[PDB]
Amino acid sequence: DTRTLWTTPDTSPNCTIAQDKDSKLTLVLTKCGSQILANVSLIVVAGKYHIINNKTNPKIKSFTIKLLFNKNGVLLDNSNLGKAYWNFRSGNSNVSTAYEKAIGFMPNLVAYPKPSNSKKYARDIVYGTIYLGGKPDQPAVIKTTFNQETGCEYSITFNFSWSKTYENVEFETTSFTFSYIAQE
Amino acid sequence: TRTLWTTPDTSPNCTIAQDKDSKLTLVLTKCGSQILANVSLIVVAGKYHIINNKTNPKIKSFTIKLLFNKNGVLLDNSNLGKAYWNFRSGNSNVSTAYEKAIGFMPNLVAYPKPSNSKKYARDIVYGTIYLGGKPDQPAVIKTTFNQETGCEYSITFNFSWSKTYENVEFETTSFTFSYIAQE
Amino acid sequence: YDTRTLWTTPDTSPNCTIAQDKDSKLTLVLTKCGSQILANVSLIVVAGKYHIINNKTNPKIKSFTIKLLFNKNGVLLDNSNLGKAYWNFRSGNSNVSTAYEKAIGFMPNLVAYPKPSNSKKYARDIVYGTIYLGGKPDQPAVIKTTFNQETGCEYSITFNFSWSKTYENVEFETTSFTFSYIAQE
Ligand SMILES: CC(=O)N[C@H]1[C@H]([C@H](O)[C@H](O)CO)O[C@@](O)(C(=O)O)C[C@@H]1O
Ligand SMILES: CC(=O)N[C@H]1[C@H]([C@H](O)[C@H](O)CO)O[C@@](O)(C(=O)O)C[C@@H]1O
Ligand SMILES: CC(=O)N[C@H]1[C@H]([C@H](O)[C@H](O)CO)O[C@@](O)(C(=O)O)C[C@@H]1O
Ligand SMILES: [Zn+2]
Ligand SMILES: [Zn+2]
Ligand SMILES: [Zn+2]
């Protein structure tokens, strides 16, 4: 109702992009009535997307992190984010019990409809720019899409892409804030 | 009572050039002293539906105005229609039109009404939305608080672009901003 | 009395020292929404070095920083650029009668944004944004907000204002920027 659904703010890897637990996705979802206030950042610690080099690897330009939810708002097992520490805040960590329901934290289906025969509108997307290493001249685009995945009831997906040729740049980002209309 | 919105549907509610030619999706959530705001626009017909700058070089901007009285009631003078601007009830509105919404109005000390005194830029918020969800099609959304005359409160959205777009449908991604509330 | 809001008040009375005493008004509003702080910021320089920007006359004037430093209790330290006099909890459009003793719930989270130490420094304690001088679209200036990266304090929120363009006689008064950060409690 007014609680926080988050990933914990530690640096302990909780996310799988290319290989297992290669990244820490810090995501904090806070319910303010009909809108959800969201704060996001990413640290890649290992694998394909850890150290970006577009001189040696020119085709590594984008990747996606998917969060898939069922009818009750529980994170599905096939999401990129691990189910382990995706829960309500208890202090600096989480409560002992994994949550039953989080429908109030899901994106609104009327505002952000699933793919169908009807006309797809752009309002289910939010664009933002974060910066690698905190450097102002190293931007990367974060594209957030609501409810556009199949095999779920609700989805939040993060697409990270860049158009610059980076040479040995560690992929860890500044933080970005956005919001979206809630289901309940 | 914590949310003022246009309804999350796609039923056209806004007049830019011709009558009801657009859908302005605006949600205002009260968070104490600040109002969390989320906004997108879909133009369905008329002058600003399919943008062609190579045919029409002058069509580069337009403004949607919301004008309020002392009680925070929307005026029929505004670009957005009064019919579907109300407090949240599920995925729709309350059956009765609201009487007072001063808590949702932009703070007068922070954003003063037009007057002989100095005008500061802090009553403006700048954002970038994208047409058709395409990253290579940016358009500027300029939000201004309490800068219209003939009303007590106002939130205006100015859409502008500097790129030459050919056959591009004006339907936008969402943008989130906030402002200081009157009470 | 509103304990869910820490602000400078939304007036235009100089409260901040960048180059000379009270040369600016920093309007900052911190609204607590559970474990996230919704923040709203703008800057008006009224006098001194950074008031009227002329980069043709003064090529090197391209940046400045406004620092807010806090102790263990979340009280603003006097060596901060922002004056303590009107940094308080909200009462109407003004502040409460007496200065606050605690505001830990408004401080940046320490696990999320750790104090300078021997550990690996992560970029997530930075929020980048762009505001505009005079409200003109062709006059951008980058606002860089960093959490808990100053030494000599327990908490800190710093605002670095910088620009790349050569501005000639431009009054440094900005549009508003909204962001959020994870709260300590
Ligand atoms: C934080 C920020 O806004 N950075 C922007 C920078 C800076 O204006 C300059 O590098 C001066 O620091 O310019 C860019 O064109 C770039 O480098 O790709 C876009 C980027 O978004
Ligand atoms: C979402 C986003 O930030 N898009 C930006 C794009 C993309 O960086 C590139 O098109 C790579 O896809 O580049 C622009 O110069 C453009 O096309 O006008 C600015 C625009 O704001
Ligand atoms: C509000 C906004 O996005 N302004 C942007 C402007 C405008 O697109 C053009 O001036 C057209 O008015 O273009 C810039 O390249 C510039 O002038 O430095 C970046 C700046 O951020
Ligand atoms: Zn690393
Ligand atoms: Zn259309
Ligand atoms: Zn001045």
What would you call the shape of chain A?
A: globular
Strand content of chain A: 35-45%
Number of domains of chain A: 1
Named once each, the bound ligands are:
N-acetyl-alpha-neuraminic acid, zinc ion
CATH architectural category of chain A? Sandwich
* Main pleated-sheet profile of chain A: 5 strands, antiparallel
Rg of chain A, Å, rounded:
16 Å
Query: What percentage of residues of chain A falls in helices of 4 or more residues?
Result: under 10%
Give the quaternary arrangement of the chains. homotrimer
CATH topology of chain A, anyone? Adenovirus Type 5 Fiber Protein (Receptor Binding Domain)
Largest interface: A-C, 33 and 25 residues
Taken in chain order, the helices and strands of chain A follow as: EEEEEEEEEEE
Strand order in space, largest sheet of chain A: 6-1-2-3-11
Structural class of chain A: mainly beta
Instruction: Give the CATH superfamily of chain A.
Output: Adenovirus pIV-related, attachment domain
How many helical stretches of chain A? 0
